[PDB]
Design a binder for this molecule. Structure first.
Ligand code: 4K5
Length: 269
């Protein structure tokens, strides 16, 4: 949690983010594998700074198997040295239509994500991620017997406050109705629960949430908020899962369940 200047060999670039680049690396002492996130700079630059900083502050206190870990910080640009999750992100995996994820594995993924969010929500005060979407779910392993299959990543937009937070969120297909409207109304970690419903939906169907509809942006947002528009749950969905998704994506945040219930229900599938 103290810096790590050098001691890191770069191996390859694996991604990009809101504030910089992401590379796969090795450590010399152990040679253990790692991921490095750099910060590369009204202003956009301030948002980038704030985001990098926010990820560090939030991640600084977290330790859970289903949460990417922060290992150290670096100072030359600067950088966050984190856990390397080798199977990539969920969004890309789901695009491989020819190789559907095995049902047992889908369940592992759902549970693992729920456990991570449950842990976020049990913090004092609770953490609201605000960016829970498939690109931000990383895959440790697709083996149904692995210790960990999925981890929550990218805490750049995260808040951890005693009160409700606010701020308009884009990526409306993944975000709660109370967070996407033009008037900047307040919300809570119940917003993340809604996003999780959409994560459940994407895993279940292998489809992007709301991809079945086509509307202009204003109409789409109004539909989600004022008409209760939601993705259609397939007929073949197991009843207990259908129930969890429906409750989680309730228009009323108060109706979205506590993760103790969500985790118990998912475990029954
Ligand atoms: C071997 O590790 C990966 C491979 C990929 C991957 O499958 N690639 C295939 C196509 O070229 C780019 C990398 C990936 F997207 C993410 C990987 N791992 C990983 N591990 C940790 C993180 C991090 F920063 F959040 F802590 C992360 N961020 C993703 C890249 C934006 N990615």
């Amino acid at each position: 949690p103290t810096l790590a200047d050098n001691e890191i060999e770069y191996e390859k670039q694996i991604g990009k983010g809101g504030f910089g680049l992401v590379h796969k690396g090795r450590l010399v002492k152990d040679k253990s594998v790692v991921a490095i996130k750099s910060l590369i700079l009204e202003t956009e630059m301030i948002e980038k700074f704030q985001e990098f900083q926010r990820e560090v502050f939030i991640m600084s206190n977290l330790n859970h198997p289903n949460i990417v870990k922060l290992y150290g910080l670096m100072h030359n640009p600067p950088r966050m040295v984190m856990e390397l999750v080798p199977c990539g992100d969920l969004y890309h995996r789901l695009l491989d239509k020819a190789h559907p994820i095995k049902w047992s594995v889908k369940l592992r993924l759902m549970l693992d994500i729920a456990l991570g969010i449950e842990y976020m929500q049990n913090q004092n005060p609770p953490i609201v991620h605000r960016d829970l979407r498939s690109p931000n779910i990383l895959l440790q392993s697709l083996d149904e017997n692995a210790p960990v299959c999925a981890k929550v990543a990218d805490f750049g937009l995260s808040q951890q406050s005693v009160h409700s937070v606010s701020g308009l969120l884009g990526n409306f297909q993944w975000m709660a109705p109370e967070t996407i409207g033009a008037e900047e109304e307040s919300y809570t970690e119940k917003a993340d629960t809604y996003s999780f419903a959409m994560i459940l939906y994407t895993i279940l169907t292998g489809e992007g949430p709301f991809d079945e509809y086509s509307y202009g942006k204003i109409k789409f947002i109004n539909m989600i908020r004022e008409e209760g528009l939601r993705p259609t749950i397939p007929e073949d969905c197991p009843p207990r899962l259908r129930n969890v998704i429906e409750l989680c994506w309730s228009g009323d945040p108060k109706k979205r369940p506590h993760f103790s219930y969500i985790v118990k229900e998912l475990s029954e599938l």
